[PDB]
């Protein structure tokens, strides 16, 4: 039946985008995969289908690595404000960079 | 003639740090390796032996990379103001991140 195509991992990372009310959002990722991510929304209304451009932020030691992304909201949990998102139009460099982060995180 | 321990490449990258004049420096790299980098000095005096804490920045596509690093000036060509620098005590995670980015 339905199958998650990419493993989802809880590696430390942040999402930054401009949402409703032209308010910026800076939130901790609940999980991350080659296909998308999840985070906890912040008060401002958000609904499945909403589309945003933003930056994925990764920091370890004195490395900071950033990824500009387009994502569409695919689920919003009213109780927890959990928002689940799908990347749209990921460039091959981006895809590969994501997989590097995720492969390294898996197995240490 | 010496064999360079790390291979050097010419890619779009910049170095930022606070110089001797206490004013900011923001310069394009001449080249980069996992061991260090070079750039042309334009402002304040700078000499071999100087230590700085800086930020190495790279950006291609939607990808942006940044490494906070201590570096030591190894050489300065007084004529061209070419500065050659060596990274100080990088973590293996950081060297590996450099060797990755370079390999391209
Ligand atoms: N990946 C995923 N998709 C979801 C989920 N909830 C709804 N869907 C999607 O909506 C279809 C119907 O979901 P369902 O009503 O729970 O109806 C499901 C459900 O009754 C059952 N089922 C499928 N996988 C599982 C499972 O892992 N555990 C249990 N207890 N039942 C499952 O088979 C039916 C058909 O499933 P699918 O053909 O895959 O088609 C599913 C799926 O495409 C979810 O939690 N995870
Ligand atoms: N890291 C992360 N990515 C997210 C999240 N929400 C959406 N995405 C990404 O967006 C893809 C499409 O989401 P979908 O349309 O809801 O289409 C989904 C959805 O219908 C279903 N599904 C998968 N996992 C679940 C689940 O846990 N609960 C429910 N109800 N459905 C699920 O399976 C389809 C395909 O799943 P994927 O192949 O993984 O493909 C997902 C995933 O790459 C999230 O919370 N975290
Ligand atoms: N439309 C959509 N919604 C998503 C997606 N991913 C997560 N969600 C929503 O976020 C809820 C929590 O996701 P979870 O923590 O991964 O917690 C999930 C997860 O651990 C598990 N699960 C459900 N489907 C799958 C699957 O297809 N593959 C795997 N590995 N786990 C699944 O079941 C738990 C509860 O799933 P849900 O009741 O459906 O509750 C999910 C769902 O409402 C997605 O891809 N598409
Ligand atoms: N001044 C200097 N430059 C270095 C040194 N090591 C590498 N290079 C530079 O790297 C280029 C390619 O080096 P190579 O692969 O060894 O490729 C070189 C190498 O195979 C060979 N070669 C040139 N000089 C020598 C030498 O003195 N001893 C040996 N065994 N081979 C040499 O000729 C190839 C083309 O030489 P180039 O046109 O000059 O282009 C050289 C040269 O610009 C060095 O130790 N000193
Ligand atoms: N103190 C110090 N100064 C450095 C260093 N690397 C570069 N420089 C200085 O900046 C010039 C190098 O520019 P290049 O593009 O690598 O172009 C270089 C380079 O391609 C080649 N080459 C010369 N020596 C070597 C070597 O020992 N090993 C290798 N692999 N190539 C060399 O010949 C060109 C001219 O080399 P130079 O006449 O020496 O002129 C050099 C030198 O004055 C360093 O590691 N330490
Ligand atoms: N990307 C880049 N990194 C730099 C530069 N200058 C210094 N570094 C980094 O700092 C290390 C020590 O530089 P060095 O003391 O001048 O000690 C140098 C230097 O004495 C010699 N050397 C290598 N290439 C050249 C050259 O082209 N010209 C001259 N005159 N000497 C060179 O080989 C030694 C070791 O060089 P490396 O193994 O590569 O190891 C170098 C390198 O990792 C630069 O201009 N560009
Ligand atoms: Zn299923
Ligand atoms: Zn030669």
From Swiss-Prot, chain A:
| Domain PilZ positions | 3-103
- Source domain of life: Bacteria
Where does this protein reside within or beyond the cell?
Periplasm
Which residues are the signal sequence here?
none
Function per UniProt: Required for alginate biosynthesis.
Query: Which family does the record assign?
Result: Belongs to the Alg44 family.
Protein name from the UniProt record:
Mannuronan synthase
Originating gene: alg44
What portion of the full-length protein is represented by this chain?
A: 16 to 121 of 389
């Amino acid at each position: 039946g339905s199958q998650r195509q990419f493993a989802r991992v809880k590696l430390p990372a942040r999402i930054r985008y401009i949402g409703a009310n032209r308010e910026g959002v800076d939130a901790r990722l609940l999980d991350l995969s080659a296909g998308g991510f999840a985070f906890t929304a912040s008060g401002a209304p958000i609904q499945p289908g909403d589309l945003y451009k933003g930056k994925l932020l990764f920091q370890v030691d004195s490395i900071s690595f950033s990824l500009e992304v387009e994502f569409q909201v695919r689920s919003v949990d009213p109780a927890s404000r959990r928002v689940g998102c799908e990347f749209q139009n990921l460039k091959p460099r981006e895809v590969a960079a994501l997989r590097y982060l995720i492969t390294s995180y898996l197995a240490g």
